[PDB]
Amino acid sequence: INSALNQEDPRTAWEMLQGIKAELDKVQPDEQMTPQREWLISAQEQVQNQMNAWTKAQAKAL
Amino acid sequence: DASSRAGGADFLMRVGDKKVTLNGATTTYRELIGEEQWNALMVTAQRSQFETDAKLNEQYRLK
Amino acid sequence: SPMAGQLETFGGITPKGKGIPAEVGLAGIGHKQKVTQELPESTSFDVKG
């Protein structure tokens, strides 16, 4: 999860997080909230913040 | 049981205003339970949907 | 595709959930460009005597 949060492109980080969620679905095969799904929700929120900061730089360069 | 299921908040909110006779006294289901106990039950029923369903929590938090 | 339904249910938060494409999770997040193609115009010193 931490390596997926240290990517330069947020679009790659999002897909990496989706892959990690798919991996986790095989060890927690139910619907309740666990402290490990909170990890992934927080990671996705952080990736959204990173996308905001990334669009700053892209717009400035353009 | 109803506090731990989706849609149980609506059921409990509707049933709190209905009558029951126990020990020779006729009360409502909200009066039979305590006032603070009823408020705690309401909070549990409203918040349990986001603990027994990670999909809802993820959807709302991402929104 | 025969696997169009298996790909959408890949990466969900729960095994009954659906994965979120980046075009939807990151949708709406962006910044406008402050520079436009509205150029300044020059005027000629035209005196017809």
From Swiss-Prot, chain A:
Membrane-traversing stretches: none
Cellular localization per UniProt: Virion; Host periplasm
Highest taxon in the source lineage: Viruses
Family: Belongs to the T7virus internal virion protein gp15 family.
Role played: Component of the cylindrical core that assembles on the inner surface of the capsid during capsid formation and plays a role in viral DNA ejection into the host cell. The inner core is composed of stacked rings of gp14, gp15 and gp16 proteins. Following binding to the host cell surface, the internal core is disassembled and gp15 is ejected along with gp14 and gp16 into the infected cell. Gp15 probably remains associated with gp16.
Assembly and oligomerization: Homooctamer. Interacts with gp16; after ejection the gp15-gp16 complex composed of a gp15 octamer and a gp16 tetramer probably binds both the viral DNA and the host inner membrane. Interacts with gp14.
Name recorded for this polypeptide: Internal virion protein gp15
Phylogenetic lineage: Viruses, Duplodnaviria, Heunggongvirae, Uroviricota, Caudoviricetes
Curated annotation (Swiss-Prot), chain C:
Superkingdom per UniProt: Viruses
Subcellular location: Virion; Host cell inner membrane
Function: Component of the cylindrical core that assembles on the inner surface of the capsid during capsid formation and plays a role in viral DNA ejection into the host cell. The inner core is composed of stacked rings of gp14, gp15 and gp16 proteins. Following binding to the host cell surface, the internal core is diassembled and gp16 is ejected along with gp14 and gp15 into the infected cell. Gp16 probably inserts in the host inner membrane and remains associated with gp15.
Subunit structure as annotated in this protein's UniProt entry: Homotetramer. Interacts with gp15; after ejection the gp15-gp16 complex composed of a gp15 octamer and a gp16 tetramer probably binds both the viral DNA and the host inner membrane.
Family to which the UniProt record says this protein belongs: Belongs to the transglycosylase Slt family.
Note on domains (UniProt): The N-terminus contains the transglycosylase activity (Potential). The C-terminus is essential for the viral DNA translocation into the host cytoplasm.
Protein name: Peptidoglycan transglycosylase gp16
